[PDB]
Design a protein around this nucleic acid. Structure first.
Ligand SMILES: Nc1ncnc2c1ncn2[C@@H]1O[C@H](COP(=O)(O)OP(=O)(O)OP(=O)(O)O)[C@@H](O)[C@H]1O
Ligand SMILES: Nc1ncnc2c1ncn2[C@@H]1O[C@H](COP(=O)(O)OP(=O)(O)OP(=O)(O)O)[C@@H](O)[C@H]1O
Ligand SMILES: [Mg+2]
Ligand SMILES: [Mg+2]
Ligand SMILES: [Zn+2]
Lengths: 636, 98, 650, 49
DNA sequence: TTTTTTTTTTTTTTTTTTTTTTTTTTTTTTTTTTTTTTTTTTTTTTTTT
DNA sequence: AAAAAAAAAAAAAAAAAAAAAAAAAAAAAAAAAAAAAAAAAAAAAAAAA
């Protein structure tokens, strides 16, 4: 229907003279600078934003979106043909692939004889000589689709879908162009690869071996061949776009090149790509016809809401003396009360600083167990923290138990062998694992959680598995202490009903009891009725921060390693020995150990991180001790 | 192709494909018959027989039924191509059924 | 070959008859309006009631049902002609328009067991349960290839030879130009139709109780693919056909059969309603007339066979109406479902109420104490074993999303199961994970549960805490908790017994005259239509299901229609209602709320405040109020006050 | 036939037909050479080539 | 311009070669699929002081 | 309440037959054409007053 020479001229014009004011209102020829970087081998992937193309050619964007492989090829050809005139100097031959490329170019010019007409099969394939990758950032005018609804009418189209990454393979070499050499001739044979499998060539087709009518057997070689980084990921529908009685639908995304190593399992991503078929050869198929598998060919992978990858006033509120309180009060502002609980949860999000002295690691993660009466927002707070934290996993009861927490060995699909997949504690490694209904958790899981919370590893020596998993996750647990309710007739450690080891692993065991109280029940009921009435928490002095903003603040506080002075050591020691003396003297106290002191230290370093200082001060210690004291306040 | 007279140029080897919608199919069931428990000699494994039922003999019986079968003792006729693997040292043997 | 047909007489006559049937203007206008409605809904399949054809054309109806393939080709050509007559551009958009069939297939209505070989090339209506679904795959029907050397563009057509003979020339994919220039396929310009295969099994409740199940394979093509998921109960109307085998010089005479669906419909003919203008007007007048005691009238009309339990019936009406989910902007969630627990003495009709809700509500799932254990109640994770990949499997509570789970003998469940129910009951979702997959399944279901107290009979001299055996966290999930006692008072006994004997005397009107209730022995069901997949006076005529003519009761069909309309209402808490509810909650949390020798049946937590809000919202929905007024709040508060306390005797 | 597509059935045994328009033909003549009359031995039939 | 011998020369065939066309044609392995075991990893009912 | 059991009960791996599918696959004979040569009849031009 359309002339592709005209379309290649169109895309060449767009690339050469599209400009914006991205750097401070300065017209900079957005794609010309990238073409320069591509010509100097300083940049591999070029992402073409179809919003830019629509700004000056909307029907080009529609053509791109309705036959996307064709236009990925056209754009790659335009870039190939534009690169020679954007080269300002000589490439330094970054790697071995470059050495091969420029030897091939050198030998082609050397024996050129330009006026001669060569065979169409006697040049280098285009993809053998690129060293750049071209991708589309789909137009914002295209609404994201639901994985279920990406069907046969969208084969060959540029679509965006959103989902959770459930399974992503390791980066592997996928061959793009197979290179062979001959035992007779000294030419190279090239086999561009489109299929999922190929039959390696046997004879060479070289001119010099066709003249000689020799054997000319050719030898497949990795050296001159071309590979690409390749990952296979599965991606699932979000819970909120699954129909009523259904389970979420997966799509296979074939990730390759510079788009690899972006998405890890558990990530919320938005993927732009082309929806393409893979022919289903071989299977003696019940139905006649050319049936094929589908996949998404990735072009742009963007990590979404919690997986997401400052103005002077922003730093102003960071430097505000009430920043800690404002962040803590932004924790699930629809739950009334629980002010100190939200402070403790904020500290869990920030965490302490890991210490590695002389080969003896002590974690920086903070663990918190909310053990409360029924209906006190424990599951709501757990769910909020799961929504907010960047690498969080939520588990409940025994729906994700055993290998849903640890790893399991699973049949690989890409090659077919036994690959290790992590459960919740691996997907939450270096994040938060929210373990709801902790008191009703299978004992094998509880022992695994012992090792996770202190050693930050999972050791497995079962039949198919002999490994040690990294599980460097904070544990936010929720439980009911004994028989559903806290009764004062029985001591702690009797209605807590956690062994001293497990109990001591938690930096804070927060006790919540909802004792009835007329004015307090009115305050809660008014808050809740307002929330039911307006779908939001009532106005207060300070508007709560967005979850994006909260994430940014917490992240900035994360890389803020503060140290403990020598001057505080006596103060901290006195606090520890004091806590320990109440534990001994009191008859209704929990188990106190050196873990209580480490809890003091890491709580206070998390406070200091929140002030974004580099040295823990006495007020940080003071607030940490107050938190440890409040954690058992309800029993008074 | 038997009709190579309606034109001088010829048809290939094996030109024929089954026309599935032009075939008259009938019902078809296979039964496993075991020797009656009272008829098995004392220390003795039971004997079995494969049964082949047809149009209205299909679904006339269910597993567990005691039946009396009347039929042709017959062998499978699928083309004297016996190339089995590890077992079957036996030559000239074909599967029996009724 | 290469022959064309010059005005085939039978195809011409058939297409004429079908276009006469479709062009309904001198007649009632049914199918002409239906074709307009598919044009406007942007669809390309018309579902035709075969009874309408029998009414208009016996000869067509019989010929269509017995020779399905060519008849359906004629009727789809006629449909395309008719659609073009109404709207030529729409007809231009879609290559072919399709025809699904529905209605009453007399002898063609079969089960997977009864679908024998005598129905080959006939239209059949098969009912069963979907055991396996394939992935939805695209099947290329028109491929477009560009030749970069010559700049030429090529198109190849692939005809649907699923059940026809397919010579290898019909399936070659072009890869080279005539002079061996490579072609590149234009994926975006090619046309694909997606293809699925499912297996339908004879429903376990309908299969002969002894033997193994019988199945049939079904080919689903575009528009029909994702209509059924494993575990669904479906009708599939389609053509039963032999598939071709591969090319070979030898054949056993054995053919592999499939059903090519022309229509798929869910058993849940209770999950899709049909409202005419008169129905809507009747609903609107019923809501406007008595907008005050309409709720009581609906409640007392709920399980008419059960006498008494007025509060329990009001609560069940609130459960069937529901509250409103709060979906906060930060993704936070407050549920809007009501969960009810019925504790009580033996034989007080709580199973009857569960059975009523099972036969009344849409998307209602039944489950008993130990008949659904572990993963059969929430979801499960299994491994595909063909691809080696993990798969999700939906349990009872996932399948009841936006529905009800009626858990009978709740006390005889395991504690493992009862603690698995917690997350579904409160947060409305199932979170399950094995190593290769983690999901969060929506189970937005309300739980109606019936249990017996410990000791089987409720001891009135012990506190309700120790008669119910449930811990406080579980009890908190159930927002209403009814103790249904067998008070052996003679007056109440007379009331109950008179009612029961009247229901044991009732005989259906004219349909019966002294005869017995048939067993329905698996050949009688296929004789008639299935009521499950089948195709309003606001009141019932009074005979002796009621003693005297003093107070009318709502028709069951109208009550289904009315509740379906009222469920969509989203009433808003007004400030007076919110203040009243808050004050009542603070009073109810306090000790003065309970006198001496009265005891709490369930704890009062913040969940009780949301219980009040949800009950008031459901009450407001019953009136179609759009606001939660003070009357709704005080009805909710009296429900809670009634259910949450119990006097203990000495 | 060279082309393979395992899902599709195979082509027949002898499937190939000369396409006459896609053929590079050249001129072609056959001659009859007789031994030169002055080269034939005396009582002797001439040879041909 | 009546008679009369070489000359072809059109018509029967026959040979006869060279070339193009015609005619003939199941068996044997392999593989997926289904339905079985079988070791191992849980996990769900058993009892005590 | 936990501690051994003692089953399901799921997976991976194996077998293990079937039953279907897939893969191999030129040379010998004939006829027709076009060309020759050969027996016969037929049609020419030299004879003379
Ligand atoms: N400040 C608050 N305190 C208590 N409950 C609240 C508060 N704010 C809101 N709620 C309500 O509590 C209800 C949820 O119960 P929740 O999620 O607290 O159970 P839980 O704390 O896990 O208790 P359980 O121990 O029974 O599991 C939510 O609907 C929420 O709206
Ligand atoms: N108002 C009523 N009160 C009690 N029983 C009634 C009433 N009306 C009818 N029944 C009859 O009582 C019989 C027994 O009721 P059902 O079996 O539902 O009791 P149940 O409460 O489930 O007993 P259990 O707790 O032992 O299961 C039913 O046949 C029902 O029809
Ligand atoms: Mg909870
Ligand atoms: Mg009952
Ligand atoms: Zn060579």
């Amino acid at each position: 229907l359309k002339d592709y020479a005209l379309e290649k001229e169109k895309v060449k014009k767009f690339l050469q003279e599209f400009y914006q004011d991205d750097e401070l209102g300065k017209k900079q020829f957005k794609y010309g600078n990238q073409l320069v970087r591509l010509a100097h081998r300083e940049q591999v992937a070029l992402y073409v934003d179809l919003d830019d193309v629509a700004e000056d050619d909307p029907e080009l964007v529609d053509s791109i979106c309705e036959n996307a492989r064709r236009y990925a090829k056209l754009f790659a050809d335009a870039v190939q043909e534009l690169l020679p005139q954007y080269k300002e100097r000589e490439v330094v031959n970054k790697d071995v692939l470059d050495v091969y490329i420029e030897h091939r170019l050198m030998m082609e010019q050397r024996s050129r004889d330009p006026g001669m007409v060569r065979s169409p099969q006697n040049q280098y394939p285009a993809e053998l000589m690129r060293r750049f990758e071209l991708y589309f950032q789909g137009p914002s005018s295209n609404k994201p689709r639901v994985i279920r609804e990406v069907r046969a009418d969208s084969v060959g189209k540029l679509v965006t879908v959103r989902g959770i990454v459930t399974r992503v393979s390791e980066v592997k070499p996928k061959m793009v162009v197979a290179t062979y050499t001959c035992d007779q001739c000294g030419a190279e044979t090239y086999q561009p690869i489109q299929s999922p499998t190929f039959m390696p060539l046997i004879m060479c087709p070289s001119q010099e071996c066709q003249t000689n009518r020799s054997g000319g057997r050719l030898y497949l070689q990795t050296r001159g061949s071309r590979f690409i980084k390749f990952q296979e990921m599965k991606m699932q529908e979000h819970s909120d776009q699954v129909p009523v009685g259904n389970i979420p639908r997966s799509i296979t995304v074939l990730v390759e090149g510079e788009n690899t190593r972006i998405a890890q399992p558990g990530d919320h991503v938005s993927v732009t790509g082309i929806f393409l078929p893979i022919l289903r050869t071989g299977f003696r198929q019940v139905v006649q016809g050319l049936l094929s598998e589908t996949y998404l060919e990735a072009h742009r992978i963007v990590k979404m809401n919690k997986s997401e990858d400052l103005t002077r006033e922003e730093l102003r509120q960071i430097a505000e003396e009430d920043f800690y309180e404002k962040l803590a009060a932004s924790i699930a502002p629809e739950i009334y009360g629980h002010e100190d609980v939200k402070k403790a949860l904020l500290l869990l999000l920030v965490g302490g600083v890991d210490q590695s002295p002389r080969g003896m690691k002590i974690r920086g993660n903070i663990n918190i167990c909310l053990m409360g009466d029924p209906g006190v927002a424990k599951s709501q707070l757990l769910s909020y923290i799961d929504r907010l934290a960047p690498r969080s996993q939520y588990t409940t009861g025994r729906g994700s138990s055993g290998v849903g927490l640890t790893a399991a060995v699973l049949r690989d699909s890409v090659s077919g062998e036994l690959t290790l997949e992590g459960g919740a504690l691996v997907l939450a490694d270096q994040g938060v694992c929210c373990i709801d209904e902790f008191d009703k958790m299978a004992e094998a899981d509880r022992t695994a959680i012992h090792e996770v919370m202190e050693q930050q590893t999972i050791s497995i020596a079962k039949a198919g598995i002999l490994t040690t998993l990294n599980a460097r996750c904070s544990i936010l647990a929720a439980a009911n202490p004994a028989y559903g309710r806290y009764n004062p007739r029985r001591s702690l450690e009797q209605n807590i009903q956690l062994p001293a080891a497990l109990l001591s692993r938690f930096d804070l065991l927060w006790l919540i009891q909802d004792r009835p109280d007329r004015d307090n029940d009115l305050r809660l009921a008014q808050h809740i009725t307002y929330v039911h009435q307006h779908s939001r928490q009532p106005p207060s002095q300070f508007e709560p921060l967005d979850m994006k903003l909260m994430r940014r603040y917490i992240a900035m506080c994360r890389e803020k390693q503060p140290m403990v002075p020598e001057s505080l050591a006596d103060y901290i020691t006195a606090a520890y020995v004091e806590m320990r003396r109440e534990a001994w003297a009191s008859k209704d106290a929990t188990y106190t150990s050196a873990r209580t002191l480490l809890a003091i230290l890491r709580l206070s370093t998390a406070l200091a991180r929140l002030r974004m200082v580099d040295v823990v001060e006495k007020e940080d210690v003071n607030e940490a001790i107050r938190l440890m004291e409040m954690s058992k306040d309800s029993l008074l | 192709c038997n009709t190579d007279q309606a034109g001088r140029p010829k048809c290939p080897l094996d030109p024929y494909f089954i026309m599935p919608d032009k075939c008259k199919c009938v019902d078809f069931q296979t039964l496993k018959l075991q020797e009656l428990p009272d008829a098995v000699p004392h220390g003795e494994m039971p004997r079995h027989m494969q049964l082949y039922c047809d149009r209205y003999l299909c679904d006339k019986v269910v597993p567990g039924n005691r039946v009396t079968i009347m039929g042709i003792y017959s062998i499978k006729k699928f083309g004297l191509t016996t190339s089995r693997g590890r077992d079957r040292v036996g030559v000239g043997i074909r599967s029996s059924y009724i | 070959a290469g022959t064309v047909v010059l005005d085939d007489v039978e195809l011409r006559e058939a297409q004429r008859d079908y276009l006469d049937f479709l062009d309904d203007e001198e007649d009632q206008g049914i199918y002409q309006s239906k074709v307009r409605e598919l044009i406007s809904d942007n669809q390309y399949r018309l579902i035709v009631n075969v009874n309408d054809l029998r009414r208009k054309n016996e000869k067509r109806a019989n010929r269509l049902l017995n020779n399905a393939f060519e008849e359906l080709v004629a009727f789809q050509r006629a449909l395309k002609d008719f659609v073009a007559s109404i709207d030529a551009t729409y007809a231009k958009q879609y290559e072919e328009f399709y025809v699904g069939l529905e209605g009453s297939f007399g002898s063609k209505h079969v089960s997977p067991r009864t679908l024998t070989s005598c129905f080959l090339s006939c239209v059949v209506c098969v009912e069963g349960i979907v055991t396996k679904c394939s992935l939805v795959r695209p099947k290329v029907v028109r491929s477009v290839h560009y030749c970069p050397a010559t700049k030429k563009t090529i198109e190849r057509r692939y005809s649907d030879l699923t059940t026809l003979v397919a010579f290898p020339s019909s399936s070659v994919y072009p890869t080279k130009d005539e002079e061996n220039n490579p072609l590149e396929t234009e994926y975006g310009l090619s046309v694909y139709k997606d293809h699925q295969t499912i297996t339908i099994q004879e429903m376990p409740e309908k299969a002969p109780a002894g033997q193994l199940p019988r199945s049939v394979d079904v080919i689903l093509d575009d528009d029909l693919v994702d209509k059924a998921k494993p575990g669904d109960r479906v009708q599939v109307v389609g053509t039963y056909r032999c598939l071709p085998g591969k090319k070979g010089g030898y054949t056993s005479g054995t053919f592999r059969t499939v059903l090519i669906a022309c229509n798929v419909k869910q058993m849940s003919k209770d999950a899709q309603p049909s409202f005419s203008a008169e129905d809507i007007a009747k609903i609107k007048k019923f809501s406007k007339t008595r907008s005050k005691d309409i709720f009581d009238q609906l409640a007392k009309s709920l399980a008419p066979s059960i006498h008494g339990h007025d509060y329990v019936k009001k609560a069940i009406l609130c459960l069937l109406l529901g509250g409103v989910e709060r979906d906060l902007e930060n993704g936070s969630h407050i549920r809007g479902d009501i969960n009810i627990l019925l504790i009580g003495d033996p034989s007080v009709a709580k199973s009857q109420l569960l059975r009523y809700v099972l036969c009344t509500a849409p998307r209602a799932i039944p489950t008993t104490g130990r008949g659904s254990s572990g993963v059969g109640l929430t979801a499960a994770v299994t491994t595909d074993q063909e691809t080696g990949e993990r798969r999700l499997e939906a349990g009872a509570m996932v399948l009841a999303d936006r529905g009800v789970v009626c858990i009978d003998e709740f006390d005889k469940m395991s504690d493992m199961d009862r603690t698995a129910i917690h997350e579904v009951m409160e947060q409305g979702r199932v979170t399950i994970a094995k190593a290769g997959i983690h999901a969060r399944l929506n189970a937005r279901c309300s739980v109606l549960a019936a249990a017996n107290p410990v000791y089987g009979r409720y001891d009135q001299y012990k506190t309700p805490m120790e008669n119910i055996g449930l811990q406080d966290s579980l009890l908190s999930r159930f927002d209403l908790l009814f103790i249904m006692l067998d008070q052996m008072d003679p007056e109440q006994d007379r009331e109950i017994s008179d009612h029961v004997l009247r229901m044991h005397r009732y005989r259906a009107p004219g349909e019966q005259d002294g005869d017995a209730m048939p067993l329905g022995s698996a050949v009688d069901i296929l004789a008639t239509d299935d009521p499950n997949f089948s195709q309003y006076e606001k009141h019932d005529n009074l005979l002796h299901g009621t003693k005297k003519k003093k107070e009318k009761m709502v028709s069951a069909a109208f009550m289904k229609k009315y509740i379906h309309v009222a469920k969509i209402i989203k009433p808003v808490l007004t400030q007076e209602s919110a203040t009243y509810i808050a004050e009542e909650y603070s009073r109810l949390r306090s000790q003065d709320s309970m006198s001496s020798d009265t005891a709490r049946t369930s704890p009062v937590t913040a969940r009780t405040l949301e219980t009040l809000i949800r009950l008031a919202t459901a009450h407001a929905k019953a009136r179609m109020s759009k606001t939660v007024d003070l009357q709704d709040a005080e009805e909710a508060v009296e429900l809670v006050q009634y259910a949450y306390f119990k006097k203990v005797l000495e």
